[PDB]
Structure formats: C-alpha cells, structure tokens
Amino acid sequence: GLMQFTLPVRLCKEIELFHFDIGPFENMWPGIFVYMVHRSCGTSCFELEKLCRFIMSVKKNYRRVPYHNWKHAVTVAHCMYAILQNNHTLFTDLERKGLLIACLCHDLDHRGFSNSYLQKFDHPLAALYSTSTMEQHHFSQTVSILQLEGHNIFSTLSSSEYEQVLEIIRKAIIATDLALYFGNRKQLEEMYQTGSLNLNNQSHRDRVIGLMMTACDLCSVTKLWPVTKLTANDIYAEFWAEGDEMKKLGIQPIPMMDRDKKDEVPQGQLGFYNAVAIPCYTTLTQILPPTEPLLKACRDNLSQWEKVIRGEE
Ligand SMILES: Cc1cnc(CSc2nc3ccc4ncsc4c3[nH]2)cc1OC(C)C
Ligand SMILES: [Mg+2]
Ligand SMILES: [Zn+2]
C-alpha cells in the first residue's frame, strides 16, 4: 500500500524521457516496470504480490534469443510508459492498465523466427494460426499466465471491465504484426487529413492504440545512436540465423536475413527508416503531438545511417 519503488536519481530523471535505455542490470528491470505501472496507472491498479508474480512468470516465458527477449519486452513497455505520461488525459484507466501489460507480454515465447519462417517450416503454430501466427501465440501465452493461481492482476475488475481490458491487450498484441501496420497507418493518415479522426469512435481508438504499439515495438530507432547501432546487431543476429534456417529448407532468404549480404545493411536501414519508421512516428506525432521527440530521434538516426553509407562512419 505505502511501499513505493524508487530508482536512483539518474534513472528517476531519464526514465521519463523517450530515449531512455533500461541498462544491462537484468535484476533491476522488474522494479523499473513496477515503477512505471505505479506512476502511469497508480499504486492501487494491481496487488503488488500478484503483479510481482505476473512479471516473473512473464520473464520466464521469454527465451534466450538475441533480440526478441525479456529486455525487448521491458524496453517496449517503457516507450508506452513515456507515451502515456506525455498524453496524461487522452487514455482511460483500463487503457493505461492494459497497454503496459500488453507491451510486456507482446512477444511472449518468441523463438527468434518470423511468421514467414513458421509457414515455410510448416510449424504447428502456422496450422493453428494462419495469419499473425506469433502474435496470436503471444496473446494465448498472456491469457495462460493470467490464469495461473495467484497471477490474476485484473481480479478486482468487474466482468465487463475484465473482458474490455483483455480485448485492449489482444488488439494491442495483434497490432505488433508489422504486416498489419502498413494498412493501419494509411487508414489513420486519411482520417487525420480529411479530419474524420474521432477519439470517441472505438474503431478509431483501436487504430491509434495499434499505431502506438508499432511505435513502441520499433523504438530501437528512437534511441541515441550508440543504443540504436548496438540493438541493430542483436536484430541482425536473429534475422541471419533465420536466413541460415531458410537455406537449410533449400530457400534463398531475402537479403535482410542473408548474412552473405552484411555490406547492404546501411542501405537496408535507409529503406526501413523511409518506408516504416519515419511514416510511423510522423502519423503518431500528427495524432499525439507530444510524441514528437520519437520522430526527432528517428530522423537523427536516419541521418547517422546516411553518414555510414558516405564512409563518414
Ligand atoms: C527495429 C528494426 C531495425 N532494423 C531492422 C532491419 S531493416 C532492414 N531492411 C533491409 C532490406 C534489405 C537488407 N539487405 C541487407 S540488410 C537489409 C535490411 N535491413 C528491422 C527492425 O524492425 C524489425 C525488428 C520489425
Ligand atoms: Mg513480435
Ligand atoms: Zn516486439
């Protein structure tokens, strides 16, 4: 009840900023998450004993893969934290509750492989879930953990509030399927520009939460350059392994997953910034003006990649 989490001064200040790095001390990450829940949602949103036991069960169900790991989960939750804190009044009590949990849970039991590889391998999950394969799995895992004894952090919610929060988390997690981002942002762009965007329209809120999820999920590109560059190494460590496994099935992977084409990384990053990242944080800034620092950091990192190609680094 009266037990607050308190970070060291440097973390207490920098955790509020969009570009915050949660650091290499894994044992501090649960406390960092709890701190963000208490300030974003309240010290009463969850029973501390249940929340702590939810967190540690979520952690256990993240694998030791180079990128799609426990650090990613907490990193994506912090970006959401920074969005919710800078947009205090735009989001309901249920939404702030559901979205930090959704981000922590969004990649549960990731194996370091794309939906496309599961399909080509003929993985059992690809039979169970024809589209957004891993994302349907991530939500399934989230429900399973919530249903463990002592793990139901939403127990104090009514039946309709419980169905509402689980529906927010499901849409939120399915939205992290990048395949769905392109159409979602296009719809949002049209709605913003024709002035039809309406935050009291539930279908519109869903779309806006969807784009927030893409923005938080890609937030590697919104860090300071050294963090962005070193996270790229972990991302490519997974992709190149997936490319190796494509070659094992007798399929040439796309250049992005082919370690033989490491040289093309800098130009690959430009395409990704221009095609995915900048449009994402631009549409997000239009809808939620105070998320401008994410767009600004994204553009700074595009500039850094342009310098790599020009042999300036
Ligand atoms: C955050 C982030 C950072 N980097 C990437 C890699 S983007 C990328 N696109 C291409 C296209 C061709 C290509 N040829 C050699 S490397 C390479 C690429 N890397 C993805 C990413 O997001 C995924 C994790 C969704
Ligand atoms: Mg994912
Ligand atoms: Zn993710």
Swiss-Prot record:
Positions annotated as active site in the UniProt record: 68
Tissue: Abundant in the putamen and caudate nucleus regions of brain and testis, moderately expressed in the thyroid gland, pituitary gland, thalamus and cerebellum.
Chain sites annotated for binding a divalent metal cation 1: 72, 106-107, 217
Ligand binding (3',5'-cyclic GMP): 68, 269
Binding residues for a divalent metal cation 2: 107
UniProt domain PDEase: residue ranges: 1-312
Localisation per UniProt entry: Cytoplasm, Cytosol
Sequence intervals crossing the membrane: none
Binding site for 3',5'-cyclic AMP: 68, 269
Protein task: Plays a role in signal transduction by regulating the intracellular concentration of cyclic nucleotides. Can hydrolyze both cAMP and cGMP, but has higher affinity for cAMP and is more efficient with cAMP as substrate. May play a critical role in regulating cAMP and cGMP levels in the striatum, a region of the brain that contributes to the control of movement and cognition.
Domain remarks in the Swiss-Prot or TrEMBL record: The tandem GAF domains bind cAMP, and regulate enzyme activity. The binding of cAMP stimulates enzyme activity.
Recorded family membership: Belongs to the cyclic nucleotide phosphodiesterase family.
Record's disease association: Dyskinesia, limb and orofacial, infantile-onset: An autosomal recessive, early-onset hyperkinetic movement disorder characterized by axial hypotonia, dyskinesia of the limbs and trunk, orofacial dyskinesia, drooling, and dysarthria. The severity of the hyperkinesis is variable. Striatal degeneration, autosomal dominant 2: An autosomal dominant disorder characterized by striatal degeneration and dysfunction of basal ganglia, resulting in hyperkinesis.
Assembly and binders: Homodimer.
Protein name: cAMP and cAMP-inhibited cGMP 3',5'-cyclic phosphodiesterase 10A
Gene: PDE10A
Residues of the full protein shown: 724 to 1036 of 1055
